[PDB]
Swiss-Prot record, chain A:
Entry function: Subunit of the fusion protein that is processed upon entry into the host cell. Mediates fusion of the virion and cellular membranes by functioning as a class I viral fusion protein. Contains a viral fusion peptide that is unmasked after S2 cleavage. This cleavage can occur at the cell membrane by host TMPRSS2 or during endocytosis by host CSTL. In either case, this triggers an extensive and irreversible conformational change that leads to fusion of the viral envelope with the cellular cytoplasmic membrane, releasing viral genomic RNA into the host cell cytoplasm.
Mutation effect (residue 27 to K): In strain: Omicron/BA.1, Omicron/BA.2, Omicron/BA.2.12.1, Omicron/BA.2.75, Omicron/BA.4, Omicron/BA.5, Omicron/BQ.1.1, Omicron/XBB.1.5, Omicron/EG.5.1
Coiled-coil regions, chain positions: 7-49
Species name: Severe acute respiratory syndrome coronavirus 2
Protein name as annotated: Spike protein S2'
Outcome of substituting residue 39 to F: In strain: Omicron/BA.1
Length: 49, 49
């Protein structure tokens, strides 16, 4: 437990990167969280919406 | 631009629209600006035969 100072930095960096990566699987109000499905399921005028 | 089409195809004349006439006859840019004018012509463009 002597090296908590250096472990905290690594933990913070890893956790921030993990949160950034996990933010990709969110709808944000859209129908689907993957844009490949959106582009292959609707016409452009609402695909862009 | 002037032409004559069917009654059900008046909706197809718009940016980002799909259809037989929309794809193979007349296509509008997605960034189209202007106005669209249409009127029925049974008294001029209709024949009993």
């Amino acid at each position: 437990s002597a090296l908590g100072k250096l472990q905290d930095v690594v933990n913070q960096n890893a956790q921030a990167l993990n949160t950034l990566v996990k933010q990709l699987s969110s709808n944000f109000g859209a129908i689907s969280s993957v844009l490949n499905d959106i582009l292959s399921r609707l016409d452009p005028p609402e695909a862009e919406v | 631009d002037s032409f004559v089409i069917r009654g059900d195809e008046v909706r197809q004349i718009a940016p980002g629209q799909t259809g037989k006439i929309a794809d193979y006859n007349y296509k509008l840019p997605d960034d189209f600006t202007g106005c669209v004018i249409a009127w029925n012509s049974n008294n001029l463009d209709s024949k009993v035969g």
